Structures are given as C-alpha cells and as structure tokens.
Design a protein around this ligand. Sequence first.
Ligand code: CDL
Ligand code: HEA
Ligand code: HEA
Ligand code: PER
Ligand code: CU
Ligand code: K
Ligand code: ZN
Ligand code: ZN
Ligand code: ZN
Lengths: 196, 121, 226, 107, 65, 459, 180
Amino acid sequence: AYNGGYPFHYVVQYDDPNYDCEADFEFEEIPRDEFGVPAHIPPELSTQIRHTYYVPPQYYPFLKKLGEDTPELKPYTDKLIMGDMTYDDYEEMFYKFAKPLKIYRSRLPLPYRTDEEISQEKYVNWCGRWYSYRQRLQGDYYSRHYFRDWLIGVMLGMYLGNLCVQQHRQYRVDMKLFYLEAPEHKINWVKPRGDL
Amino acid sequence: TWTEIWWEHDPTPKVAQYRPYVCTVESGKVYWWCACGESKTQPWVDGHCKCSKREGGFRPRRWEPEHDGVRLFCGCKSCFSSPTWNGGCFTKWMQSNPAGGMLYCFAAAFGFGTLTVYRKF
Amino acid sequence: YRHWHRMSEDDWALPLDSMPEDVKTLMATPQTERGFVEDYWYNRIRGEATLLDPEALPSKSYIALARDMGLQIVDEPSSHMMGLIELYEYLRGASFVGPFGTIENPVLVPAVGQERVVACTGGVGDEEHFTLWFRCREGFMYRCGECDQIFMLVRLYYEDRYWTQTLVRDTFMSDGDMFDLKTLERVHKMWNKDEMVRWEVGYWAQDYVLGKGVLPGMVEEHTRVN
Amino acid sequence: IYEGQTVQESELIPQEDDWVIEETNFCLGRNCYVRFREEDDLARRALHQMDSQLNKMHTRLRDGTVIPYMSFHPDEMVDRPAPIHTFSEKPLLKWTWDETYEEAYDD
Amino acid sequence: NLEDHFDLAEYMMKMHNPMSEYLYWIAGFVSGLHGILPLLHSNYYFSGMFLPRDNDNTQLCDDSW
Amino acid sequence: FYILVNNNKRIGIYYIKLSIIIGILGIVLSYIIRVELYNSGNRIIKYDNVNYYNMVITLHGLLMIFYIIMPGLYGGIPLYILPILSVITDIVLPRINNISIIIVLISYIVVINSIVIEYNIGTGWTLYPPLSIIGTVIVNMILYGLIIIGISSIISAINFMNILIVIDGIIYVYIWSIIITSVLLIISLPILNGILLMILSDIYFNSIYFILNGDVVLYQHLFWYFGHPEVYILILPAFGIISIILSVLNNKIIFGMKSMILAIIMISILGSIVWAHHIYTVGLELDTKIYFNNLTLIISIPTGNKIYNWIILYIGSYNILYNGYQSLIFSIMFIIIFIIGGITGIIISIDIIDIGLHDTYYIVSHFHYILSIGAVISLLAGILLLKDIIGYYNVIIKINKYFGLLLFININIIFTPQFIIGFNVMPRRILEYSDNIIVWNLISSIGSISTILILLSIF
Amino acid sequence: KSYYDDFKDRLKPGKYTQGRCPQSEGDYRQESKTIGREHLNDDGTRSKRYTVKEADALGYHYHPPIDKKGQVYVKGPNTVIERGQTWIKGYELPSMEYTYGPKQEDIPFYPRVKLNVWGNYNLVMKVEFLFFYLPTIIVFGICIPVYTINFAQEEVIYTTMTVKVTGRQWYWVYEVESPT
Ligand SMILES: CCCCCCCCCCCCCCCCCC(=O)OC[C@H](COP(=O)([O-])OCC(O)COP(=O)([O-])OC[C@@H](COC(=O)CCCCCCCCCCCCCCCCC)OC(=O)CCCCCCCCCCCCCCCCC)OC(=O)CCCCCCCCCCCCCCCCC
Ligand code: HEA
Ligand code: HEA
Ligand SMILES: [O-][O-]
Ligand SMILES: [Cu+2]
Ligand SMILES: [K+]
Ligand SMILES: [Zn+2]
Ligand SMILES: [Zn+2]
Ligand SMILES: [Zn+2]
C-alpha cells in the first residue's frame, strides 16, 4: 500500500558465486528473490505460492521453551516448529508483543516550592476563579457601553453630513435661478477675438 | 454604574466633588490621590481616610507628572483616567441628577448647533 | 517517525568490511569504551554465536540470552528515560496535544537545555484562548495568566550529558562474563566446513583472530582493486 | 467568541472569611537602556545582555507558582536583540483535548 | 561562542567602529547627489547656467533683480 | 562576512537599510518637484531642461514604489519576523533570500547610473506608449531595472509561500497578509513581464504593437492588470503590521481574526479584477465602465470591516499604560489617515466624478495619503515596535511626541491643498501652471521643506 | 528622588571621541596577542581572520564538537533534595538595578488582570454584521446613481455639428466644417 507494493529495500540472490551485476555484461544469469523465486516467475504467481520458514530441528526444543514460558506466544512457535509460519505470521507475532515505553511522573524532580507556598494552592485557585468571573462580566458591561457610544458618532456624523445637504439644497435653488433671473448671465456678449 | 448595578465586589467611592480639582504639580515628585473621597486634603490622601488606612479595598493612587504645570484631578473618584480628569465627573453627576444633565446637554448642543449652522449655512 | 526519511541499508545491517580487524581486543573492550561500529559488531558476533548454538539455548536464561544479544532488560529508571527520549523525538515533527495541566499533573515540557518556548491555548471548546507564548525555564512551576494551566519543564540531563539511547544503555547495562573466543571457534566449525560458510560473520571474525588471511578464500576476499 | 474561562459558583466559595484578592505587583521593575560596563569585553557584554531579558522574568504567586512574561506572538520570545539561531528546540504549542488512553494510568 | 550568539554582536554590544556608520550615511548622501548633480549638469548643458533665476523665463520689469 | 550572509534576519536588516538609502534619493526628487512648483516661472529647472522634470517625477514614482516601500514592507519586516512568527528556525530558501537583496541593489545601481550617463527624459512611472517607445536609452535602462526587480519580487514571493509547508504554529493575521501578497505577485508579475517585453520589442526589436492599427490601449490593460494589484501588494503588509501593533500594545486579542483574514483574501480577489478604473477616460464601453465602477466600490466593504475591527482593538484598553509611544501613535494615525485616502478613492471611483479628477493633483493627494503617509508610517511603526528585537539605537524616535505631531501636521500641509487644486484644476505631471494656482501650490511647498527638516531631528 | 544619582558612579564620562584612541597611539586593528584571545582584536572586536579569512564554515580549523558517544557537555540543574523529594531551584535573573542601573524601589503597582475581552455574543454578532452590511448599504446607495450618470454620458444625441480635434507634439489641431 506504499510505493506501488515495491519494497524500498529487498534481498536479491545470484547462483554464480563470482557474479557482479555492475562489472559483468552477460545475458544469461537470472536473479532470484529473498525466498529464492527466479525472476522469470512473475510476482502475481510467486506471491500466491506459500513459503514457510524452516529452522533446523535442533531449534525445536528452544522454540518449545518459548511457547511454554509465554502461552500467548505458543501458537506462533508451534507454527514455526511445524513449518507453517509464513512471513505474515512472523509479522503478526512481532507486532503483537511490542509494548510502548512507560514514563513515571513520580520520578520527575519538581520546581522548588516551600511548604508554606504549597498550603496556599487553594487560595490562588480561588483568586483565579474570581478574576475569570470579573473578566467575563466586564466583557458584557464594556460591550454595551462602547457599542452604544458608537451611536453618538453616527448621530454626530448625521448632523455634520446634513449641513452639507442643506448647502447643496440651496446651491441647486441658486443654479435654477441663474439662467432665468441672474444679471450675471449675459447673452450676445462675447465676441470672437480672432487670430493674433 | 459598574459598581452600582453590575459588580458588588469592587470598592465603591464617595463623590468628594462633581468638579475636578486644579493643582500645580512638579516633575520628579510623586503624588498620592484619594480613591475614597473622604480625605480632607483633597485631591490627595491625608493619612486618615480609607486609602491611607488600607481599609475596605481602598488604596492611594500613585501619580507622577512628566512635566511641571497645572493639571486637573478627579473629584468624582470614578473618572476613567483617574487620578487625572477627563470629564467623568460631569458624566457621574448626570447619573445622579439626570434632569440637570439634560439641561446642560441641551444647552451645550444648542450652542454647538447655532455656531456650526451659522458658519456653514 | 513521520519526520524521518527512508531507512538506509545500514539501518538494517552493516557491511562485513566495517568489522574491526582486531577482533581479539574488540571482544574484550568494556561497553562504555566501545564506539558505535565496535558496539554493533560486538553484539552481532556474540549474539549470533549464542543463537547459532541450538543445543545450549534451552538451558540459557532470558537474562543471559538478552545479555548475549545485547538487549537491555528494562526497569523503571531506564523506561522513564527512554520514554521521555522518544516523546522528545516525536514532538520534533508532531503536534503537542494532551490533557489540561494542573498542579497535581503539570503539562510536561521536555527539553535538553534549560529553557523551551511554550504556548498555552487554554482548555477545550470555549475555554480555548489565543496563543499565549512564554519561555519555560527550569525550576519554576509556571501558571498561565489566563486559564491558570500549570506547566513544568522536564530536562533530559544526566551527569553532564543529555539522555540518549547510548547513554541509557551504558548507565544501566552491566557487562557480564567476558566473551570466550573458544565459543566463536566452536560455532565457526559448526556452520563453516568444507568450503561451505553458513556463518559468514564468524568466518570473517575467526580469520581476524587468526591474523587476517589465514582461512581459505579470505586473502581473495580482502584483495580489492580500488 | 472568547469570554474567559467558565466559573461554577462552588469554585468562588472561600475557605476563610478574610480571603481577598492577592495584591502582588505585576510591574517587573524600573528599566532603561541596558547599561554595559566599560571593563566588560564582547563576551562578557553578551552575558550581561542575556541577563537583562524581560521575557525571562516572572511574578511568583502566594502558592509558589509563577506567572511568566507572556505574549500573543512568538516574536517576543527570542532574546533581544535577536540571536543568529533562535528556536533550536522547536517551540511547543500545547493543545488541550478530553481524549485519554488507559496506558497513561495505573491502578 | 558567546561573541557569536548575537547577530552583529559588535554593534549590538556597542563596540562597533564608527566608520561603519559613516559609510552608511555617506552612501545615502551619494544617493541623494544623483538627483542634484545631473540637474545642475543638464541645466548648464542646455542653458549655460547651473541654476535659473526665479522667473527668468518670463518678462521682467526694468528694475527687476 | 557581509554580502555572503544568508541569515534571514540579517537580510531583513539589509532591506530596511537599503530602503532608507534609496529613500534619500526619493525624498530629494520630491523636494525638487515641490521647490519647482512653489510659484509660476522657472525656479530650479530651466525651460530648456524641462525634460529633467519629466525624469524627476518618473524616477520619484518608480523608486518610491518598487525600490523603497515594497522592499521595506514586503522585504524588510517580513524577512525578519515571519520565520519567528512561524516558530521555524529560518526561512525555507536561504540562498534565494540572499540573491534577492543583491538583485535589488544591482537594479538600483543601474537606474541611478542611467541618470548620470544617459540623456534625462521622462514618460511617467506608468511608461505609457507610444511616448515610452519613442524615447532615448534611459527608458531602456529603466526597463531593465523593472524586469530585474520583478525577478527579485517573484523569488521572494516563492520563498514566503513555502512557509505554509513548514509553519509549526498558527497562521497569524500578519502571516496571512504576506501570503496573500505573495499570491498577488505570483499572478500579476507574469503579466507585467509580458507587456514590458512588448515595450522592449517596440523599443529594440522593431515591433509595431504600439503604432497605428496596433492598440496602445492594450498596454494600459496589461500594465494596470498589474498596477492595481501592486497598490494592494504595497498596502496589505502594512495592514498586517497594524493588526499586530494594536493587539500587542493594547494587550487585546484580535477581534474577528477570521474576518480580518477573510477580508484580506477578499481584497486580493477584488483587487485582481478592478484594474480598469485607471482607464476610465480612454473611451471604454458603457457596460465595461459600469462593471469596473461597480466592483471598485465593492472593495470598500472588506476594507471597511478591517478598519472597524482595528478601532475596537484600541477601544477599552487600560488607561494606566502610557499611550504616547511612537509606535502606538503611528498605528492610530494610520486608521485616521487611511480613511481619508480610501474615501477619496471611492470619490474618484465614480467615473463621472473621475472625468473631472483624472490626471489632476487630487489623484496625487489620494495615493500620497495612503502611501506617502499611511504606508510610510506603518513601516516606521513596525520597525519601532521591533526596536528591542532589531536592536538599533542612536536615534530619538521611540518616545518623541514632537516628531509625530510635526510629521502629521506638515504632511497634511503638503497633500490637503493638492485635493483643492484638483477642482481648480491643476493637471498632474506638469511644472508650469497658471498664476491663480500659486497660493495652494505655495502652501504645499512650504509643507515639503518643513517635513524634510523634521527628518533631521531624529538623529 | 533622582534615580540617576544612584548609579552616577558607574557612568564615568568618556575621554575619546567614539571611544577609541587614534590608531597611531594604539593599533586596534591588529589581533590581540593575549593568550585565549586570538579570535579578538585589541579593542575586543572579532578579528577578520576569525570571521572572514579563516571562517570555520569555510572548512578552516575543522573541529567536530560532538564526541564518540554522540554527546556534548550539558550543565545540570541546581538540585536540592528535601522533604523526601528531589527539587530543582530555578535560576532567577539578577536585580534589574545591576543590569539597567535604576534602584528597584517605589515601583508603581500594576495588578494582575485577565485579558480584556468583549462579551455578549449576541450583541457582538450584530455589531459584526453591521460592520459589514452598513458599508454594503452605502455601496448599494451609490450603485443606482452610478448607473444613471454612466448612461447619461453614453446617450445617443441628435448632434448637428462636428469638430475634429487632433493632438500633436505639442499643439492641438482643429478641423471644422466651413460654411457653404
Ligand atoms: C529616510 C532617512 C531617515 C530615516 C529616519 C528614521 C530611522 C529609524 C530607524 C531605522 C533603523 C533601521 C535598522 C538599522 C539596523 C542597523 C544595524 C547595524 O548597525 O548593522 C551593523 C553594520 C555594520 O557594523 P559592523 O558589524 O561593525 O561591521 C563591521 C564591518 O563589516 C567591517 O568593518 P571594516 O572597517 O573592515 O569595513 C569595511 C569598510 C572599509 O572602509 C574603509 O576603509 C573606509 C575608508 C573611509 C572612506 C570614507 C568615505 C570617503 C568618500 C570620499 C568621497 C570623495 C568625493 C570627492 C568629490 C570631488 C568633486 C570635485 O568598508 C568597505 O570597504 C566598503 C564600504 C561600502 C559602503 C560605503 C559606500 C559609500 C558610498 C560610495 C559611493 C560610490 C559611488 C560611485 C559612483 C561611480 C560613478 C562612475 O552597521 C553599519 O553598516 C552602519 C549602520 C549605521 C546606521 C544604522 C541605523 C541607525 C538608525 C537610523 C539613523 C538615520 C539614518 C538615515 C539614513 C542615512 C542618511 C544619510
Ligand atoms: C496603496 C496605495 C493605494 C490604495 C490602498 C488605493 C486604494 C483605492 N484606490 Fe487607488 N490609487 C493609488 C494607490 C492606492 N489606491 C495610486 C498610487 C493611484 C494612481 C496611479 C497613477 O494613476 O499613476 C491610484 C489611483 C486610483 C484611481 C485613479 C483615479 C484617476 O486615475 O483619475 C482610482 C479610481 O478608481 C482609485 C481608487 C481606489 C479605491 C476605490 C481604493 C480603495 O482601496 C479604498 C478603500 C478604502 C476605503 C473606502 C476607506 C475605508 C473603508 C471604510 C471607511 C468603509 C466605509 C466606506 C465606504 C462604505 C465607502 N485609485
Ligand atoms: C510610496 C511612494 C511615494 C512616497 C513616499 C512619496 C512621497 C512624496 N511625494 Fe510622491 N509620488 C509617488 C510616490 C511617492 N511619493 C508616485 C508613485 C507619484 C506619481 C509619479 C508620476 O507622476 O509619474 C508621485 C508624485 C509626486 C508628485 C507629483 C509630481 C508630478 O508628477 O507633477 C509630487 C509633488 O507634488 C510628490 C511629492 C511627494 C512628497 C513631497 C513626498 C514625501 O517627501 C512627503 C514627506 C514624507 C517623507 C519625507 C517620509 C518618506 C520616507 C520614506 C519614504 C522612507 C521610509 C523608510 C523606512 C521607514 C525604512 N510626489
Ligand atoms: O490604484 O487604486
Ligand atoms: Cu487601481
Ligand atoms: K515653476
Ligand atoms: Zn481616600
Ligand atoms: Zn472624576
Ligand atoms: Zn492559558
């Protein structure tokens, strides 16, 4: 499920003891995999073939001792003795018996605090709660005061704006009377200067 | 109104005066301001009020001017910029006499309206 | 860890050309005096010597078997140190999330130095506040000014050194009976005979004890061209 | 929006009738330009600067815990002036959740 | 080393040679000259004067000076 | 070493140092302009050397925009604090960071050398063809500087974008401000390069894009498609700084952090689609004009949300804290000043109002209030906030109420009268003018000399 | 009181402009010969050899700090066992008078106070809505005027005369129909 199923690292075997894939340029040697499968047998077929680990029989008594001392480990050891342990079975055994590292808080040295100070812990917590109570209430109080004040700014900005509305209103009245009554408006007055 | 209706666990001062106290102060000198309104050497702690005796949560308010001059100081004991005055003395007065507050505010607004309208028109 | 890159070939095993050529002294060196490469090959030679002797395994105790393979029997002191080491490494490229810290159980902030920058985000949900950064110096029980979350600095320090897997192994593991070279030779003859070498490490190791070039094919194995 | 930590009335009940709010000064002190001694060389003036860091200061409460110099952003957490290499040990942003696992506890 | 902890340690520890500051100010001064010197040069090139006399491109009274 | 250093914090200092140096040349040019405009007549530039004035205004604009404010707000403060705000050891691309500052310096040397050696002519900082393509070699040199500057800007933008991959903490508003400016650069710069290459082709390769049957209005579209995003690439870092200063100095958590962030994103998208409000008087189609006018007015919405969120940050802050620090004053002054500049921007946004106010000193005052006042003050405020971290000294700025007051008063004396002459009307990019506009021009000139004098008192 | 007088003694007024004698009177450019100061100049600044000419980052004076066991020297905490518990005493910074000079007395009182937060979620949400939609309303109030004035400029009018205006460098040419 990673890298397309290609293992990042894998074992390759060569039949010729003096073979070097970098020095030689021959075209007859066929590499094998970790289980010994020749490269010309595709993965889809070889992965179906069942491969099991065979330990020398002299190890059976040791594998038996392991099972008895740890009964949860016995089924895996039995498979290994009987030549029924595949790579997947080995992986299941490996991860089943892995445990996490443990941290003990009782071993941590503590920052220095006198016995007088240690007896005041409840008092300091009490002060902290009252500070949080006063903080939360003040938030409501302040929000009401300042957002209400912003209305004064709206009203002040509406008064000052209305002053320019009135000036504009009077301006339009004046403009309507310019071409109609204003003596400043003159017709048949400007004469062409002519080219210099 | 924080002490009056919202929070009952802060000390509540008495209003010495609804007007600021004018005092000459000198740079490099530390002044102590009465936060309870019961000192007889206003605006300063007299050594006999609540602030001086550290009674009922009242403590003197330390203050120091940057430059020499005449500075306004809070008499209402609730100004936001206490010990200095910023107008909270008038605001607190309006809370206590809302009818008077309206009269002054109307008069101030009336003058402001006339002048701004007279000049712009 | 997610922050680590891909396993190297060396992460699995080392090339036999990195085996120290003075095997006789290697197997007699105390653990505290063995370097990384020397310690790798001491454990591999001794561990594989016991594992490749099937008839003796059932009578060997787990304490002795673990010693031969170089595995450290765990105890509360070493577990604590190793655990805090792995927690430090994990936090290098991972988020720092856990239970709310109190006086009884402060937030544990591992560090190598005497200080580490830490941020408090408050509690869960509405009790979460904006990041408040502070410098967590050793020897003080810190309290957030906002949520009153208690913090504490834990230092990975031991005897003028910080905590490492190598330090933990050296401080707590005790060297057992000196490795006997007769066992190496005995196992060597067991799995290596008549041009068949089924213990390559023990064929090279025995060759070095013999003086380098003594065993068949070993002169040819050691002759390189570049 | 954030409005402080929630408080239950039970947590506001004092253990004595004289308990009031602790009056500890959170003004760190009087400061100015860091003043180096002439006698100190470059190395010893560096030590002097490192000993004048406000962000290494704190206020100790009545129970022995200390409230440190805190900031909204990590810009105020490096030595002033900023050294060449600042965050060698990655600063840890602590998140809180209610999840727990059994391995952490012992009965 | 303690000397290498702070970037620009000599300046931050107030031991730097003042010449560094002088060069910085000189560099800024030279940058400023790139706006004034070509102004004078161009004025002379096209007029023969380094700088004009206020309103000398317009008609002036007889007593103007 | 000095030039080899890759330290991101050292490079940040270099950016500020170079901005001040190049800034001296910028301010000098501004003094030349205002001196000339003091009355009608020739004052310091001969009538036969009017080409120099055209070059002065062109270089003033280009240098202040691309070599001073952009290197200062997008290169200086960002390179110093961004990796710290991101709780990362250093910047993602160390070697690229070094070359960027070197590139800026090399392009500056090319520009100033072109003043000294080439004939001095000008075509505005907007390099409109066909005027730009019928000029002398000084225009070619300026084009090389801009292209070289573009390289530094884009690589620096790439550098900041990579912080998303490594950031170990929370993306604060300021970090969001830089990231979005970086995005705006990545999308706008490639278009600028193309149109600049076409200017070169017509100047140097006998191309015919900007001669009859080729539309000169084409340049204005592609130029301003970068032009207006540029004005927000120059202001957004300033907004990020303002947010940090107000929250820190008032000890108040940012209110509406997500709305601040989403306001910055919104301004960027909108700023990428409103460029033709610079082309109202060319004669575009009615529907195009209405689209651009409509979308231009929309930008006020997100910009307005940020302003009000800043105001509530300063409201309610403790009175005991001293409020006369220069950084706090500058941050507050930014809100007061930016509103003036933005509102006038909305006025000019109405195209019919714009017909009267295009190419007049009203436009000048508009973008000066935002850049020459707002952006400068924001950069000063940001540097001032980081005085302890940066560690500079030998100046009297941190607590100097005289400097702030004098600067605010005199800067307004310069540009407030330029709004008035906009309706009189006095065109831009001119040196001679009618005698009935002297009063206001004289007042602004008195303001310019005074501001320069106040810059000497800091030392 | 005047706090400057407390540490006046420490501040001895200087003799040399910029704190250095003429190079002739003392050569501060040379490296110091004092043992253990080979990386410093005589005046205490770092020598160019140490920082530039033979900088260790360039491969000069190669000296790996880490030892064989992958360890570096680390200074331990001040540990104090007590009351059946191992304690660590933190390092407290020196008095600010030593580092800054002013005597740490008569400090103004700044009490602990939790962050000043805005409350009343419902009220705050309404304000934020207004912070966004009050500008939106104003824009909408300008939109209709903008459309109308744009339509007005682009109105098909029954023009009866044409004046052609050409702009050249630097004059304006005007072409007008001549009366018949
Ligand atoms: C906008 C303005 C106002 C702003 C107001 C607001 C400001 C607010 C605050 C802002 C703060 C920003 C952040 C600051 C961070 C500072 C960090 C720092 O200090 O870093 C350490 C850094 C270096 O310290 P370090 O670590 O000790 O470095 C040791 C060296 O690496 C190694 O030492 P070394 O001694 O071995 O050094 C080598 C040295 C060796 O030096 C020597 O041997 C020097 C010998 C003496 C030469 C003196 C000049 C001679 C000139 C002759 C001219 C003749 C003209 C003749 C004309 C004839 C006409 C007929 O130099 C060289 O070899 C190369 C020098 C290159 C640079 C100088 C270039 C000058 C101009 C050249 C123009 C050429 C044009 C050619 C055109 C050709 C056309 C064909 O500091 C500096 O570099 C100095 C910075 C000083 C200012 C800091 C900021 C203070 C606050 C602001 C004050 C206001 C400034 C306003 C702007 C300037 C106005 C003018
Ligand atoms: C950083 C610099 C900067 C900034 C932020 C802006 C911001 C804006 N600018 Fe720009 N502008 C320039 C720099 C800048 N400008 C420059 C340099 C030029 C000239 C280039 C040249 O021609 O050579 C220019 C030119 C320019 C013109 C050309 C006029 C002409 O050519 O005749 C126009 C018109 O559309 C315009 C509009 C705007 C608008 C509508 C905004 C908006 O961003 C403003 C938004 C802000 C506000 C609106 C105020 C804050 C918001 C509120 C208070 C909410 C309430 C307000 C409302 C509901 C309206 N600008
Ligand atoms: C951000 C860019 C910027 C800045 C700061 C300024 C600053 C100033 N400008 Fe600006 N100006 C432009 C950009 C800028 N200008 C542009 C783009 C044009 C149009 C170009 C064109 O028409 O083609 C223009 C045009 C322009 C003209 C029009 C000339 C014309 O075309 O007819 C005039 C004079 O009236 C003028 C005057 C000034 C003055 C008097 C100042 C200032 O001197 C006012 C006083 C303020 C200061 C002296 C402080 C400035 C300090 C710094 C910038 C350094 C900051 C560095 C740090 C904080 C590290 N400018
Ligand atoms: O440009 O706005
Ligand atoms: Cu625009
Ligand atoms: K003139
Ligand atoms: Zn009292
Ligand atoms: Zn009062
Ligand atoms: Zn917290």
